[PDB]
Each structure stands twice: as structure tokens, then as C-alpha cells.
Design a binder for this molecule. Sequence first.
Ligand SMILES: [Mg+2]
Ligand code: NA
Ligand code: NA
Ligand code: NA
Ligand code: NA
Ligand code: NA
Lengths: 400, 399, 400, 399
Amino acid sequence: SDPPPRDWQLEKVVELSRHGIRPPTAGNREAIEAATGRPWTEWTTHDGELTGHGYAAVVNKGREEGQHYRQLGLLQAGCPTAESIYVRASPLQRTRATAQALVDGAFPGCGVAIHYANGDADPLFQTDKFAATQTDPARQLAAVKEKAGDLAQRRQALAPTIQLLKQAVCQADKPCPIFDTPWRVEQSKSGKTTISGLSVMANMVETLRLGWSENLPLSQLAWGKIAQASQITALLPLLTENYDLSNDVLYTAQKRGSVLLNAMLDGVKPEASPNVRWLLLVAHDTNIAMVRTLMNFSWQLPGYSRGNIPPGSSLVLERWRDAKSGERYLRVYFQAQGLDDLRRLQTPDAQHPMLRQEWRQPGCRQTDVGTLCPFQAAITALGQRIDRPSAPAVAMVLPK
Amino acid sequence: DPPPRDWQLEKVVELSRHGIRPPTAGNREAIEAATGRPWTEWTTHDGELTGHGYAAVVNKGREEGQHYRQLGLLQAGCPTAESIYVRASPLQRTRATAQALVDGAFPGCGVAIHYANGDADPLFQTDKFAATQTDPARQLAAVKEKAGDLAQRRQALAPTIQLLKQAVCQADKPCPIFDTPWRVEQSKSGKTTISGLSVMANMVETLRLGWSENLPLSQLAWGKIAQASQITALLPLLTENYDLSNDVLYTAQKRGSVLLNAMLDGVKPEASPNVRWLLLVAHDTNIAMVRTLMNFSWQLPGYSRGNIPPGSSLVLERWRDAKSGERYLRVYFQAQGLDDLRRLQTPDAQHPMLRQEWRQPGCRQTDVGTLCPFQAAITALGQRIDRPSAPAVAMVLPK
Amino acid sequence: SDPPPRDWQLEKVVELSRHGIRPPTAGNREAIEAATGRPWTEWTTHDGELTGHGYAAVVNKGREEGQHYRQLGLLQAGCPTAESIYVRASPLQRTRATAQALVDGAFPGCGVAIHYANGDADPLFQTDKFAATQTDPARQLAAVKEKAGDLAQRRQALAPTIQLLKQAVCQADKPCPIFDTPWRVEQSKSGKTTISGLSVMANMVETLRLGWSENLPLSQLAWGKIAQASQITALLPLLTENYDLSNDVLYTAQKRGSVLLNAMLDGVKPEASPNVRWLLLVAHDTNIAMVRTLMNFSWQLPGYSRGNIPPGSSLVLERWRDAKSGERYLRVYFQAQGLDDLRRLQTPDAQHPMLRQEWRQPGCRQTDVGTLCPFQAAITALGQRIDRPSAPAVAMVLPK
Amino acid sequence: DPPPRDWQLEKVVELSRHGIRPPTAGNREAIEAATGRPWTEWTTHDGELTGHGYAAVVNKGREEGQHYRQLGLLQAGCPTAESIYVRASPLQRTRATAQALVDGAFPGCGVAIHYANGDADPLFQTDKFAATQTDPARQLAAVKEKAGDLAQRRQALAPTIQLLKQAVCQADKPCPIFDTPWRVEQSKSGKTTISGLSVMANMVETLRLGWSENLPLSQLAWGKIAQASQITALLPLLTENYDLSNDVLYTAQKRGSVLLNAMLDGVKPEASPNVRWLLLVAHDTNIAMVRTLMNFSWQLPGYSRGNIPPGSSLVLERWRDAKSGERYLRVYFQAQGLDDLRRLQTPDAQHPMLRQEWRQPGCRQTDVGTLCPFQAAITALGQRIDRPSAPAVAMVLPK
Ligand SMILES: [Mg+2]
Ligand code: NA
Ligand code: NA
Ligand code: NA
Ligand code: NA
Ligand code: NA
């Protein structure tokens, strides 16, 4: 490495990470097995929990990240103190274990603890469980229908991708129910709004992507039908489509993601509590999608479709200072590993770097540390779509 | 006086312990009763392979794959059916460890592992098969005979017991286990244990595993243990318990002969399956019985005599000198150190695996390690095998 | 450690180190053996070369120093580049080997090279070998006599210390010539000005101090007569006195030290060549004494007399920046290890820290990183006594 | 089946190599002639102990002192006349290494070392004493007999020779040594060498020492060598040369018997001097002859068979079980790894010394290592000693 930058100084990191690789959730399994009329692989990890390979991949990212932040002088050599980091994970096993993996890698052998809510609902993450942040089913129905438009036309436009999925998952000369169902907007008794057909197809594509990333034997991924990363990439358009029509619907993102984006923007400002160098939040792709929608931030990384959120990927806000003037800037980016890098447990070292895309707007400047945006203007732009009634203050430090 | 050599590695037979787990459900009940307090609940289910445990096993498997490619045992790239066969005990923790090993050794290659359909593999769960079960009266006598004066044994380990008590007992509260005399105990199903000692051994294994896991110190032993040397100081209790259980010769003969026999058969030419690397993944109890039958033990840095760390393994290597055509066996045990496990250090050139080799007269020092004339080595290693307890198994399972 | 400072940023280090522990020089030995009428211990190291124990002690300081500068974010993690450091050593073996020891410690296993002049004279260090920087014997005679004043009175005032030295080094009922010689100003045929009696006594005290620091057996240090560090400390007043009347004479320091102080002050300024994070110069106590005299900087560290310069000790200038404004400051200090720490090869970790004294003047402020002085005013004050004709520009990067 | 034990370490006898040196003057002449080019001039005089070498030895001695205090062999604080006696070969490099060891082991204690007044110590410079010199005709025959077909030996090491040539030869220039057939050569004073091989061995030792020294890569092998594995790959040439010189049994018997005899006598009770630790500091040639008489060799991570790194040592430990009163011998060789030396890594719990133990039938694994019944061990270790070449020496020198 070259010596660390002096003219630019990193002050604060706020990071929102997805959990690492998991098998399908119990609900996902029910759906995909019904959709294809056959059982899918049972993994060595319990459905919905972080797999060992998932933990290992997250450690690899955390290790390179900790080295990077020591190199830049944000963190101390050796083990951290309370001033170094605060980790808040969604209370699910998969997110707690992912949070452990990140600090396990970033601070080798340091026994760094994580924090999570006592109950099974954290108001930053399980926003459908709190009055201020719940959607109204009637509004969500309208919103999804408005964005979806002609669903027959969307289904026809995805026909080639649907065909690739069918080839991978359907048994020769057997019923494959899901490919016969027309795409329509449906609501559950709890008022969750999904698209018939597409939503379960999206569950299938995520499961295949996760199985690829896991390094499952090919015989156990899609019955030997998928053998290269490009074949996963070709399926991802269905997942993007489902996201466009669920988590990335503005109404839904405003109701269910405003509290988290608000917490993140406040967290990157000076005078944040807790007073730490790195605030690390670990949650779900749902949360990341809603936040990036409110940010109006879109990405497309090599080997992935638009907006894809891989396991152990993260959205980062960094506050930087021009040391020649004290003027503050924000850097905003999304990072992930590629499909084969995850499968191979490749460390994201200098030669196989993380995939990354930075947000920008007029007035941002390209520096040796990344794209830096005047701080207040960046905060204002990123926060425009926040629904204030849906963004109550949350104490970041869990009482614990 | 070594002759001209052209060393070629022909076959590896490896018996690995599973990686790091939290206490088993049974362990937890015993240790929580023994100390009168709850112990940390890990993010991994009791008895399963932890994420950190998986990561540490990947690291070992990655360097091992590189090594055996460098030696020409394994071809470049992904393996074939002739490269490797992996058989794991059917428990989640052993299945998951088997996966981690080939995940590291053959990056991104989707290498499968194999395990029994039921809850019992006749190589590993040997107490579930008549031919390989101990007789209760014979086992009781063997354990009594080896234990001798247990009051003296307990008094001899007093400093170690005190260190354990300091770590796990609450000030000004009862701590039941430390008040129990050590006595032989035998269950209705025939399992012989030592009262006091055996539960203390469970406690020490739990603390060693929690250290190796990189648990926060507050959740390891309530902040009382902060360095690896404090774990090392407790391990004599684990060695003592092993001496009086898995390492009792009679027990090892009944419950371990089938596995050692299978390993010695696997390392000979014409083995089924025909693979360059036979990888077996099981439990410390299995390794302990096997090494006892071999009359082989070890002492590695930071560990007590015969300690079997998570992800450690016993290895048999068959070597040929391509010039003379003579064949040799190399036998060793390998593990990572305490801090290396805690830190997820990959075992590279600067941080090598800890290793000790077996030898007997006739063995020679070579550029590839201690190599022993093959026939004499297999014969010597099999001398303690109890023939009626060694039925031949099919190594390749159904699928 | 706590996280590195953000409001204060270290930009540049310029360091002038003494060589590490050596046996007496060949000249020293001749003098001290004549002075006491007996042979002194022959060390395992050649006279005047860096001892192995000396190298080890210097490595210990370099190792903690490299860790410190990575912690503060001046240096990169891992091995350095050309931008990290430039090391220029006096061409003597003792100074080359000391320079190697410092980077050996600071950058473990990195094979960092050092630089030194092809000949046996470097114009920053062997200043008596270059026309612009040589003293005139007639002026030096006047200068030493002026400062020395009544030498009989100085000798009488040091009588208790002289007695302690006699006790350590003189044989019972044998001639010890040096203690009979009156103190007078003398000049050699080359025009070097020394004080008779005192100068050789100072040679003796340095040799004893170095033998203590070396961990020589007590039987080989002063024939068993010195057994604790306090006994070395008690002798050091003679060394301070000799320094006051040689290297610390203003005239001499101006002629022979201006070129080096000038190079050092220019080196800590922005726009210095070479463009490096750390300029490390390795030379002799003579050079350090002249420089601190020109700086008007005096120190007294625990266990040492005023101005003492221990083996492997150094004078440091650091340029710091207030990251809230870009305003620049200078920190100036002298550092060493204590006598027992050197003898024991103690690493100067957090629990046995380097002994240090900082320079200051009105306007300096105490910060969490040390005493910081407004940069231009500090440069001006430190440079007041430079004799400009004696301070020619020197290319810092050796052609080489 | 171990009995109750209370292990007490009673005596250590240690034979250490000197630490890192540059090439000797003689080495430099040979290697510069062999490659037709000047080699780096170090800041240390040819053949002397380097500053880095001193520092690395201090590190080892520091951890060793701590260890032997922890075991109760050495009292707390500074030693007494009964704690240690240090005898070094009279060369600067060995005297300086002896100092470094006690400098580390007993911080700030002014511990003295001892050496012969002349240029020859009868334990170490054995060729300078009639009883312990080889006969020229017998030595020539022994070396010829072991060497056999040297053309085959040279052809067998061709890949290694090529790696050396790539590191040290200038492109498009003559490199004399690589064009010489390997032949037995005997000087007028009786010294037997192998043409080609012996100078290549000098080159490999120089490169290994330069690596260990932390020389800039540009000054090591003109930038051609950048990692430890490249040094490891060259070491077979050093092993080959040792096999045909210091490790020839006849040679070792004549020139090594006096030293092994003194070591075995020193490790027995009632030794003179009465000290807890007898420390001898000499040369790789001495260690090689001693281990050959012991029929003991090793292979440590990153090193070829029997390699003797700078600051490495052979150790004999006499242990007593305080319960039974039985006595045991433990025998091992220890060294630091290549990167550890280069980096001046202290050998702490996380970076332990590399070690291999000797054993024979009857030895047992214990909590303090491989321990061998004392009388049987000393007898077995002394079996190859040539009695006429083993006069008794006074261990304590005049001063
Ligand atoms: Mg290390
Ligand atoms: Na840093
Ligand atoms: Na689209
Ligand atoms: Na659990
Ligand atoms: Na004075
Ligand atoms: Na030299």
C-alpha cells in the first residue's frame, strides 16, 4: 500500500449489511416446493439460518474491511474499544450470526460483542410490527397496482427468463404449477401485497442464487441443470422485477424504510449517539431495498441485475473531512462480492476487489478515496423522500 | 546414509475431529447443574458446528488442498471421483465439518460428502452395534483397574481443579461439583464415567471451545479467562478424563478396532474406493480410541498430552520412493494452536499446523518427514486391534 | 489503544538519532587506559562499532516507533514504499548499523534499505571536513576560554563527582595520572580544542555509561565497583560539564551544526525533498548536541544529567495539522530509554515508556498528541542562531 | 496407562549454533569465484555475528529463560553460580551468541560467558587435536563409499541446481560452478569436499542467512528471491553436502565423539560443574556430528532434512517423577522459522519454536513431552561414540 491519505480524513462510517448466505426460509420452501411439485435440497444448515460457508464469506469481507479502516487511520491498531464500533443486528439468528462474523473478521481474536433487541422485533428493522411504520393494505394495493400496470405485458416481456427458470427447476413431463398461474396483485389476510406467479419465481431465483453462492454441489443446486455463474445471472431479472413491485414501491419504502434511513443519516452526522467510529447495522435485503429506494440510488454490479442485493453485501455512508479546511463531505456506496467469488470463498483482496458502485449528484468530486459529495447537500438530497410521520426517533444504543 | 530418493505421495487416509461446537444439550445440563448457574447460549444451536468453526476448518482445508496439489497427489483444479472420498459421521456437526474441508481444499468445486441414512455409522457410533459394544462388567473392571486410587488422582490435580473453580464458580454461592469425591459410576446402559472428573472435563472442553470460537470474554467464563495460557492450564483435567475413558485399552479395542482396521485397509494399495485422499470426519472419542490402539500419543504447543482440538486430525500417508520402489508409511497428528483458532489464522508457512509424527525402529528421517517401512508399520499399528470387534465395512456408502 | 486522533493529523517526521551502544573508540581506549595506567575491558564488538546488544536495543525502539506511526495513520499497514521513509546515515559502521536496526524494527521483515555517502565524509555530519563548516582554531580557543572561565573553580566544584569516578576506576595504591592533571584549555595540531583532565574523564564516564547500558558483567564494567544505575547517574555531571565546554559552545555549534539544523528545519517544512513521511538521519552525539544548542533546547531526563544524549536516543521534529482548519503546528522533543531499560533490553511499550522532553515557547498548546507550536513562529525561533554562511544547501537525497 | 506423576525438570544440557553471520572470508572467496561476480558486503564483518543475529538470539533466550523459570529449573531473578554455566567456541560469532542468549534469559543480570584462551577448544575445533582428527585415507574412503555415483546424485538434484542458478547467475555471463562435475576432493591437510556441490552449499547457506538477516531483497540475490519458499527450495543442496561431510559416520565419530560424550556426562547427576543449565555455543558442523552419533535427525517446517538454522539448538533434559522417583531423558532439536527470523518474531505462545523430539522403544508420551527411561536413553545415544576419540574434558575452563 501507499501511505494513507492526509488531505482527506475519514471520520465516521455508517454501514447497513444484509445477512450472509442462508438456505430458503421455511415459508420459501413451502412455496417453491409447491410451485414445482417436488422437494428441494435440504441444506446442512437449518432453513433461514446463516450457513457456515455464509459465515466464512462474511468473515472474509469483514477482515479486509477492518484492514482497510486501520490503513485509513479511522481505527486503532489491535483490538477496538467502545469508541471504535457499535454493532446493532436484527434479532433473527441469521443477522446476529452475520454481525458476529463481520467483527470476527475485522478484529481477529478480539471477542467483540454485538447488540440486538430482547424481543423479536427491532423498530429499525421489523417495521411492520410498529404502528408508526406499518403500511395500510388499501394504500399498498393501489401503489403496487399503479407501478405494476399491465401484468400480462410484464409476464410476456420476461418470457425468455421465465423459460430459463423452467428449464432449471421443472421435471420433464411433470406438472410445474407456478408457470401456469397468471400474474395478479394479491393480498394476504395480514395485508401483505404480492404478485402471484412472479413472487414465488423470485423466491426460486433467490434460492438458486444462494445455493450457487453457498458452493452446493451442482447435483443439489438445480438437479445438475446449472453449472456456471452466467446461468444464475440470466435468472436475476425476475428478482429485480419482483423487487420493483414490492420493496422498491415508493409508498411501501416510505412507510417501512423511513425510520432506518433517518437513523442512518443522523448516525453519519457529527454529534451522533453513540459516539463511535463505525456504526454497523445488520438486517435484511428488504431493509436495504427500501433505504436505497428512499435515497433514489440505483446500481448494477458485474454479474448481477439492476439493484440486486447479494448475501453479505452492504450500503455504506462515510463522512470525510478535507484536512486543509475542515470542510465535510459524504461518500455513499453499495458493495458486494461476485457470484463466483462467494462460491469460492475468495478474499476481497487487492486482486479480487469488492464490486462497488458509488452514488453521486452534481457538485460531487472524484478523489483518491472515492466520490465525495458536499455533506449538507448530500444529506438533504438523500433524505427528500423520507415520510416524517414514519420516521420516529430511535435510540441507537439499545437499552440492553 | 540415505540412498538416492524420488519421493511420491500415493495415498492419504485422514481422520478429522469436527470443528468448533457449543456444548451439547447433555453437556449444558451437566455443567449448569455442576456450577448452579446458566452458561452462555451461543448463536449456534447446542452441539452444532458454529460459523467460526466452519471458517477455521475451511482455512485448514484450503492450505491442505494446496499442499497435496503441490505434492502431485491431487490434480490441478476440481477433483474427479478418483481424487477424494469424504465420509462423515451423520451428526450435523460432522457433516458440516466435512463440507468445510472440501469447500477449502477445492474452491468453488461443489464437492459432495457422504454419510449414513440413519443415526448410526458403524465406523463411528460403534456402541450402537453388537460386535463393537463393550461388555458392562468387563468395562467396569477395566476402568476400575486403570483408575486405581481416585482420591490420590483428585489430590494430584488439586491446583488444576482450583483454577477451574476460580473461573466458573460464583463468589459466595454453592458450586456442587467441586465438593464431590471421584468415584467410578456405571449407567444402566453400561456407560462408565468418573463422578466429579467427567463433568469437570465437560466444563474444560466448553471453555476451550469458547476460547477457540472467539466468544467475548464476558461470555466465556464471566471475564475470568483472558488469555490462552489460562485455557492450557485447565487441560490436564481433560487428559485425566480421557485416560480413564476413551483411552482405556479394553474400551478402545471394543469400540475403536473397526475404525482403525478400516483406516489401515484404506491406506494399503487396492483399497475400495480407489481415491488419492480418503477423508473421514467424526468425533474426539473416535480419534482417542484409534490413537490408543496405535499406541500413539502427542503433546503439542499450548495443549496437554493427547488433546484433540476442534478440526484436528490423524493422518496416514503412503509414500513410494520411485527410484528403489520401496514403500513407506508416515503417521502424524495435526492441529491449530489456541490463538490461531481464536483469530481464524490460516495455517500458512509462517503459522504452520502443529504436528507430531509416530515412529518405531526402522523408521527413517526423510525430506518429506518420518517414513516407516510400510509392511512393518501397518503390522505394528494393528497389533492391539481386537479381531472380533473389527468387521469389514463398505467404505463407500449407499446413494 | 483508543482510536487515532482525528482533529490532529501527523504530516511529517524528521528525526536525528544517535548511534546505538558501542565500545570505546580506539582513540578513547588509548586515552582512558593511559589515564588510569591499566587496561580496560575488551568487548566482543570491535572498538567503535555497534554492539549486538546495541542493535537489539535500537530494534526495540524502532519497533515501538513504527507501531506508533502506523497507529497515528502516518504510515501504511505492512511494508513501506519510497514515499514512507528516507534513511540517511553517517558513513561510519556504527551509524549505518543503527540506521539498519531502526528500520529492521519499524518495518519487520521488510528489507528496508538505508543510504550513506560513498566516501567517509557526509557534509551534514563530518562538518569538520568541509570548508564552509570548519571552525577556526583561534576563534574556538577564545570561545571555549570565555565559557570555561575559571577552570580551577570548575574542577573544585566537581570534586565529589571526581572522587566517585576515582573510586570506580583507580587501582588501590597505584598511579592514576589523570586525577593529578590540572584543567586547562589545549589545542591539538589539527586545532581541536579540549580541556585537559576533564575531557578524558568525560571519555571514562561515557565508557562506563555505555558498559552499563550494554549489560556487561559487573566485573568487566568497573572491576566490580559499580553495581547499580544510580552510580552511573552520579558520574554524569562530568560528561555534562565537558559538553558545556565543547559541543555546546555556541561558536562551535554555529560552525559545525548549522548545516544540519538547517537541513532538518527545511525537511519538516512542506515541499521538502525527498517527499517522504519520515526523514530519518542517524549520526553522533556531537551532532545532536550542536543542533540542540542552536535550538536553545535543554533537557534533563530521569536518571540522566542535563543534556545527556544516550545511545539510540533521538531529537524529533513533527509537523501536525489541525484537520478542522488546515493550520500547521510543530512538535519538537528529545527521547531516550533509561539506564536500566537499556541494560535489560526492555521494550518501550505502554508500561515502560520512552523518556521524553518537549520543547516549547509562548503560544504552544498542550494537546492529546503532545505540545504543538504554531509552525512558522516555531521554525523562526528554532533557527535564530543558525550561522547562514555555515549553512549551505545540501541535497538530502544522496546521489547514490 | 500413565501412573500418577509429579514432573520435575532437573538439568538442561544445550548445544546451540551461533546466530546469523555474513559469509566467512573463505566462503566469500569461493562463492564470488563460482559465480564470477561480487556478492553483497554486509555491515557486519564477514564471519561475525550480525546485530540482527544478536537480536534474534536474545528473543529465543528471553522466552527460554521465562520457560525454565516457570518450570522451577531456574530461580526467580538473577542467576547464581549454580544456575548456569556457558561455554562458547572462541570465535567472535559464538562468543557473541553466548552473550545474547544470557542477555535474553537473564535480563540486565551481567551474566558472563566462558571460552578458551587460544584459537581452539577441544570440544569444538576437534580437528586441531590428534585424538579427535580424522585419518586422511580413512576419511577419503568413507566419503567415497557414501557418495557412490556422484553423477547420479547431481542429476537427481538438477531441479534444485537450476533454481540456484536462476538466483545467482548473471544472464549471458559465465557461471563456472554450474559446469563442474561432482567429484571427491581431498586437500593436503586432509579435508575432503565434493567439487561443485560443496561451493553450491556455501551459496545456499549464504542466501538462507541473508534471508534470515532481513537484508534488502536487492542485496540478497539481486532481487531474484522474494519469499521464504524460494529459500526452502534451495536447501536440499545443503542437506546433500552435509550427508557427504559432517554426517559421514566415520567423520562424526572422530571429530564429534568428544562433544557428545561431554554432553551425556553433563546431563547425568553429579556432573561438573553443578549447574541447572549447561549451555554450549558452537557451530553447525558440531551439531551435525553430534546428531549423527545420536542417530537423530529431523525435518522442521520450511526446512530440509537435518537443516541447522542460526541460533538453533540440540537439547537434553533430565526429568524426575517426584512420586515414583524414576528419571527420564528428553531429547530434541529446536529452531525458529525463516520468516520468524527475518521478522525478529519472539517465539511466544502464538509463534512457538519449531521442535522435533527423539525417541526409542520404552519412551513415553507425558505432559512435558516425550520422556525416555534415563539409563536406556544415555546408553542408546552413546552407542556410536568412538572411545579413543572421546577423551574427558574439564567443562569449566580456566579463569
Ligand atoms: Mg503471526
Ligand atoms: Na493505521
Ligand atoms: Na425492467
Ligand atoms: Na444456541
Ligand atoms: Na553545571
Ligand atoms: Na562486511
